[PDB]
Every structure is written in C-alpha cells, then in structure tokens.
Amino acid sequence: PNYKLTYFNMRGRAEIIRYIFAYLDIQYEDHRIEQADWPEIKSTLPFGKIPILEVDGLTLHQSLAIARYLTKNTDLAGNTEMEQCHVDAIVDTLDDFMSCFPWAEKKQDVKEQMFNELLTYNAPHLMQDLDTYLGGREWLIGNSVTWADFYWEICSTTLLVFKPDLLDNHPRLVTLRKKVQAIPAVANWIKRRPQTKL
Amino acid sequence: PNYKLTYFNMRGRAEIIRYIFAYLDIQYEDHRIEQADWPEIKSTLPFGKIPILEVDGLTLHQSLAIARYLTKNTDLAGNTEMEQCHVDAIVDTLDDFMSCFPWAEKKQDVKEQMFNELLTYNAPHLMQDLDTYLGGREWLIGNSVTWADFYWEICSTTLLVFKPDLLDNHPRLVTLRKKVQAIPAVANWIKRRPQTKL
Numbered sequence A, B: 001p002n003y004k005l006t007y008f009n010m011r012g013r014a015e016i017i018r019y020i021f022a023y024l025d026i027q028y029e030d031h032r033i034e035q036a037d038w039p040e041i042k043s044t045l046p047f048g049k050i051p052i053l054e055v056d057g058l059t060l061h062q063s064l065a066i067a068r069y070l071t072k073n074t075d076l077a078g079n080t081e082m083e084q085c086h087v088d089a090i091v092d093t094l095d096d097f098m099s100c101f102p103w104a105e106k107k108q109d110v111k112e113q114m115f116n117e118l119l120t121y122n123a124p125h126l127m128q129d130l131d132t133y134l135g136g137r138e139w140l141i142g143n144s145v146t147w148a149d150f151y152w153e154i155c156s157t158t159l160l161v162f163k164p165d166l167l168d169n170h171p172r173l174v175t176l177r178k179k180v181q182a183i184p185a186v187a188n189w190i191k192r193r194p195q196t197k198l
C-alpha cells in the first residue's frame, strides 16, 4: 500500500511506527513538519493530534493503534493471542509512564523539578518492575522480539537523555536495548534517521 | 477457562472488561476489593495496578490490553484490519482524556479544581471531535457495534456524573449512548451491576 507518516522532526510518538516499517521492510514517506506547518495541518485532522498515517488516502491516528495495525499477522505482534495481550499490556504500561512527563511545560524550573521527581521516584520503581518481568529471558514476551521490545528501547532512549544513569543498576534492561538496537533493520534505521534530541 | 477480575468496587477501568464479558455471555468472578486490602494485593503484582484478570493462573493487566484480548475474533472487534485500527484509535483518544483526571488526588481542593478545568475546558472539544467523527453513521466504527462503542458509553457515563450538560448540544452522541445501553446483554448488566458513583 501507499503509506504516508506525518509527525514533527522528532523521534517522539512517531518512532515506534518508524521501527515497525523498518523491521518489516515496508516503504513509506516519512514526512516531518516544522511548527509553522502545524496549525495548517492540525485543522484538517479529525482529532488534531499527531502522528497520523495516511494509507491510500485514508487517515489513521493514535501511534499505538497504528503500530498495532502494522504488526498485525506478523511475528512482531506476539505469537499467540495471550502474548499479543502481554505485548499490548507492556506497551501501555510504558506509554502510561511516558505520559507522566510534562513535555510541554513552558516553565523551565517546573519542568526540571517534575522530571527530577519522576526520574528519582517513579522511574526506578517502573525499572524494577520491568527488570523482574523480563527476568533472565531473551525478550519481554515469548521467545522472539515483539514491538514491546521496540517500545522499551524507544522509551528508555528518551528517558536516558535526562537521567543517563537510569539503567546503571539494570544490566538486563541495557542488554535488552542492545539486542533491539542490533537487529539489522533497526541498526540501519538508527544510523539513517535524523538526529534530534527527542 | 476460569476468569477472575480484580478491581475496586466501581466501574472505573474495569467496566469495559465487564461489558465484554456480558455481551459474549462469559461467566467470571467479579472480585471487588476494599481500599484497605489493596496494598497487600498490589505488593504481589508484577506492575502494581488494577484491573487485573486472572485466566488459568496467569495475571493479565492493562484494561484495554485485556479488553482487546477478549474481543479478538469476536464481532465486537472491527470488521476489517483498518476498522480494528479505528476501534483502537477511538479507545486511546477516549482513554487519553480519562487518564488526565487526578482520580487518586488526596488534596480535595486541587482535585476539584483539576476536575473543573478538564470538564469545562477540554471535554467539550472532545465531544466535538467525536460528534463530527460519528457524523450520521450508526456506530463509531463501521456498520456494527464494536467495543469502542462500549468504551464511549462508559467514559461518557462517568463524565456525565460531573458535567450533566456535557451532551446537550450532541443529540447523535446521546443516541449512540442509548443504542449501546439498549443491547440486551448490556441492558441486563446495566440493570444488574452494583450501583456506584464511579
């Protein structure tokens, strides 16, 4: 099909979709917009939020709804319906946590203090839960990579910009990041993609 | 398949699972806990949150992850792969809004204020987005009912406890709510369920 992804020049909420396209070797236009193109584009959107994906002219929204859509009937989705559920559950747990950050906060001091609170308390807690859930197993769910592993590497990459020692006491989670990053299609993508802070 | 649902004595985030169990005529233990028994159960969980659903001795988590799992290969799922994406997208839109509420805020003044703000400033815009999106169609997605329709009815039901006039300018959305409420299995559950505020 013909696919067109629209988001800011940023990893953010679009990146999970970018990894999926890359891993599944699906071609798409990676359209990145600047703030100036936003009000213009926003008003055409049924819900006014990005990312959105247009597939043969039909517009789709919600990053995770779209990511799930793309992994349908592939091994990335989870091998059984039970695994697919654990994949969905791990993905929302991580997403619920990232949504806790005041990404849009205009007051720099408030933003800093809130980030520090979340990274000092909530983050190490969530990290112990993920570490224990993963155990000494290879991937978060089942015995092959799923887009939950993808989401983990993506969410952690962003949290590490702000608290670089976040995984210093979690070697098993660092190992998971490296396994994901080393998947050839993902390793390729990570090298080609635009460099942006978020 | 034995099913045991654990959550507080309220509709809250467990309700979507309850509507699905009813619609599909599946029997389950509807376990409702008191706040004082929570800490002991929370400590035993992989991710320390409810609802959770136990099936055959495995604890699933994330209300939507679970809802999506129970509706897989059922008529409550979208009818096409794309429709399944729209079902997911609408559920996440509704969920992103409900998640903004400080449900567990101890400071009553701060809580009331955040509630007033969201209900007064944000809720109306969501109702506009949803009303336009529904348009003149019979259900949110496609030609038949999906669990997105259930989630709409569930979210709108709790928003209406706080802002009864929310849908005065949205008759098509009240017609949709009434439509969901009229589904025999849903109607039965609505009449039968414990009557709680939230």
Ligand SMILES: Cc1cc(-c2csc(Nc3ccc(C(=O)O)c(O)c3)n2)ccc1F
Residues within 6 Å of the ligand: B010, B011, B012, B013, B035, B094, B095, B098, B099, B103, B104, B105, B154, B155, B158, B198
């Ligand atoms: C449909 C839907 C419902 C809710 C919801 C209503 S009450 C609650 N949780 C609460 C409320 C109060 C308390 C409490 O303080 O005891 C608590 O622990 C949890 N959550 C949230 C999102 C959503 F999409």
Ligand SMILES: N[C@@H](CCC(=O)N[C@@H](CS)C(=O)NCC(=O)O)C(=O)O
Residues within 6 Å of the ligand: A012, A013, A042, A048, A049, A050, A051, A061, A062, A063, A064, B092, B096
């Ligand atoms: N849960 C949604 C979040 C979408 C969202 O809030 N997108 C942001 C960009 S990260 C946005 O458009 N906000 C700016 C605006 O609404 O103008 C998703 O994952 O797609």
Ligand SMILES: N[C@@H](CCC(=O)N[C@@H](CS)C(=O)NCC(=O)O)C(=O)O
Residues within 6 Å of the ligand: A092, A096, B012, B013, B042, B048, B049, B050, B051, B061, B062, B063, B064
């Ligand atoms: N996105 C999650 C939210 C889960 C959640 O935060 N549940 C709340 C109650 S609604 C909870 O377990 N709160 C008690 C606590 O966090 O200790 C879901 O849909 O299940």
Ligand SMILES: [Mg+2]
Residues within 6 Å of the ligand: A092, A095, A096, B092, B095, B096
């Ligand atoms: Mg969500």
